[PDB]
Ligand binder design. Sequence first.
Ligand SMILES: [Co+2]
Ligand SMILES: [Co+2]
Ligand SMILES: [Co+2]
Ligand SMILES: [Co+2]
Lengths: 325, 327
Amino acid sequence: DRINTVRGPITISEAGFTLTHEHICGSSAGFLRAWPEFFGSRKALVEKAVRGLRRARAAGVRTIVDVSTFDIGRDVSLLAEVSRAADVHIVAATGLWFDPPLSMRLRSVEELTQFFLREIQYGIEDTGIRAGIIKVATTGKATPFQELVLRAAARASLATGVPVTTHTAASQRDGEQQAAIFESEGLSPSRVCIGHSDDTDDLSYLTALAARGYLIGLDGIPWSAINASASALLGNRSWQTRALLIKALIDQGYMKQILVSNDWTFGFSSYVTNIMDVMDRVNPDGMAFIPLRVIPFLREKGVPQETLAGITVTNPARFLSPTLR
Amino acid sequence: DRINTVRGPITISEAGFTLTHEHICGSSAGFLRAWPEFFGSRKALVEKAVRGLRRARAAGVRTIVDVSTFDIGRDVSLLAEVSRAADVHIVAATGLWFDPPLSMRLRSVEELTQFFLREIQYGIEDTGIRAGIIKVATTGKATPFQELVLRAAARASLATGVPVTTHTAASQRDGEQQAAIFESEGLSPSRVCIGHSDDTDDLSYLTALAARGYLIGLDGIPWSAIGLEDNASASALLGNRSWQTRALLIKALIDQGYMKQILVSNDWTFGFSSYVTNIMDVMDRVNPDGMAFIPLRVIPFLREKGVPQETLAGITVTNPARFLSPT
Ligand SMILES: [Co+2]
Ligand SMILES: [Co+2]
Ligand SMILES: [Co+2]
Ligand SMILES: [Co+2]
């Protein structure tokens, strides 16, 4: 039941404090290799990533789950280099996000299942690095292709025991549609995380999924823009409003169904040019925002350490551990 | 006299018979590295590519211009490996086609000009291999992003002298909007090939572009789905126009007095992942000659139709030579 990382298999006890939805670099397939000067240089991106992960480590984080898929420009060699120099375990991902190229979008469910399985059972590229999580996406009502991906992600999870994590348009209640698709394939709700759930205030949506066994991804707490580009991406809602949703779900009793993270990055190319510079101004803490700002905020709101350590250590370790239920 | 190939700089006299629009692998950025099993294996694709290029070489081909851009999944390491093993010069490309990812789509004209210049002046990725052509595209009326890419291509061409080649929806007469954008930037027509021009029978459209100095890419001569109208996917891609109809356009433009403006190719590939699954198998059944189709079938066909050997040698050797030479 060992969890696969970019450096090799680790046990449940070695995982520790885990951020379930992070990115070393938010890019596009082949971009980092073709145009490293966009990030200054590859060396400059590595140096920035090592510094940010070491800051996260000093604050308490032992493992981060890089949910960067093929189309988000996942570079496992970059992930391996920064994991080694920072002494933070990184769990790599397979799956598809909302920017698949023609070679991915014209594939059948059988073919996409084989691709996700290739990255989990054999390895990513020629590196032998196996993925320990599957990332998928929907932005409103699922397109015939997005449904096909969710099904392929479910089938790949049922043959390996590896978990599935999603990107949602939470306000449009995507988690319910994704649920219906995952359940029709026979996937256990305990192997799924309905991510970006901190984008909505609808508690009757979050509790309904958490009661069925789904893990709720309140994975982007520092995302706030309190000018168009930063506002359209990060949103109008504050970090406190997103952190009060962690509190609200513990008050509903569904404490064991919570996964917290930052959804941060050290390189961003899939959006406008200076978005990374604006993001580093909004949150200078980076990935260290959860143990330095969110946890002490929840402690001052009435949530004990036994509960917060269960959300950060026990919940991700149970989520990442290969099993069918 | 000098052009950049995947094996390094060569003199233009060494280029010889050149196919101006080919692909070793029609894919997507990062696809070949992440899923080589789609093509059997990377080794299987290489061996298939080497066999095909060696057969094309035995038929007379000395150089092919791989117009695969970043988003067509250009893997220059593969291009170099196959070029060396087959002993056929391969010119690599920069530019952007019609499947750019978000990291390319959100860029400004200035940023894309810098990316194209990097691949031409510095190198592709960390390989040191420099692009000798810029490939761009439109599929009907140009989107604001396509117009931006064409401007960046024009600016990269003006600074380096490397030619620009295009994908067009010839039936929509795309070459005219492309030409208008290129000339508004000050780019000379002699540095541009309006490709996929064999997809139209409109001689008025072709001759007018040729009269302005544009090179006309009659680049997919074996593309035909005749006999397989049963297959919806093969018909939508390959079309229902015969290889003979496509080849007769070469003769039509020669007869109009535009022999110096013609560039001929197959637009072939050894790996195809950017469309339906078994398309490569279907294509190999329609044309077993592959890239060798031009010298084995098209040249003897045109000779039998009355076109002199010297005119055909001028189209396959002299025209690509003048086109690829930086100026
Ligand atoms: Co997301
Ligand atoms: Co994310
Ligand atoms: Co084309
Ligand atoms: Co082509």
